[PDB]
Design a protein around this ligand. Structure first.
Ligand code: MG
Length: 267
């Protein structure tokens, strides 16, 4: 699924997305830049925290600056956070099960969905304003491993900076409340579909690995049959991790055998 929320403020955002405690189980954040806007800025690969933070403030390495300081406060909205969450069975198998290929499958599915989101990129150019498609965004993807309930959950925070290049200049992303022609409005209207696109893309890959899937909800929500999702549904990263492993062992589920059955059943 894909959750949508506005990024709070430049600083705390920087700290949240790169906070080690959010990806302790994964061991890595696996962050990377994405979006045609990023390639145009020369931003590729790993994300430097200072550059990411300044970007959320509206300051580009390009030299362009969209910050609007009003008595110590920046009124430039940082951007949006689109979170793609993998199904519980995948998260368990990836993080507690050892199958790292599923993390990679999760990334590729997220990468795929984010491209379709980028196509909605637009800016407001009042000639009466109007929205004009831009087709480029600057994004930073960060992987986290825990849900709000402290259960295993592989999810990627797709942070979309509030900037976009139009006719050479960097402008803020479109916002149209009334006609709902703005970028964010178009994202909301397709929230389900995008989360759907990500899930479908992830499903194809997991099935190519030899894994089975089963629809457990609406809009195609699915889980890998047989995985004890139940056990994980209902302060110190190291202790939390030890607990997850402990409650899993107590489910009696033989993870490795599950993996081998997928292998001897793939190709
Ligand atoms: Mg998180």
């Amino acid at each position: 699924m894909m959750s949508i929320a506005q990024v709070r403020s430049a600083g705390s955002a920087g700290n949240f997305y790169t906070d080690k405690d959010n990806y302790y189980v994964l061991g890595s954040m696996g962050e990377r830049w994405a979006g045609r806007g990023a390639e145009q800025l020369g931003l590729q690969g790993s994300v430097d925290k200072d550059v990411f933070t300044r970007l959320l403030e509206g300051r580009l390495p390009d030299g362009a600056d969209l910050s609007r300081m009003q008595d110590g406060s920046n009124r430039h909205r940082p951007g949006y956070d689109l979170t793609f969450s993998a199904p519980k069975s995948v998260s368990m198998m990836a993080m507690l099960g050892g199958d790292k290929r599923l993390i990679d499958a999760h990334n590729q599915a997220v990468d795929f969905a984010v491209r379709q989101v980028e196509a909605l990129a637009s800016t407001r150019v009042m000639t009466q304003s109007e929205t004009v498609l831009t087709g480029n965004l600057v994004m930073a993807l960060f992987n986290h491993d825990t849900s709000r309930d402290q259960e295993p959950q592989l999810h990627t925070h797709a942070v979309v900076a509030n900037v976009t290049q139009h006719n050479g200049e960097w402008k803020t992303l479109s916002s149209d409340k009334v006609g709902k022609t703005g970028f964010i409005e178009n994202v909301y209207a397709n929230q389900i579909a995008f989360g759907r696109l990500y899930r479908e893309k992830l499903k194809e890959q997991v099935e190519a690995l030899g894994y089975e899937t089963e629809v457990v909800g609406k809009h195609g929500m699915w889980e890998m049959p047989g995985v004890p999702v139940e056990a994980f549904s209902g302060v110190d990263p190291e202790i939390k991790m030890a607990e997850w492993m402990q409650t899993l062992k107590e489910t009696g589920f033989d993870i490795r055998a599950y993996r081998d059955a997928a292998d001897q059943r793939a190709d």
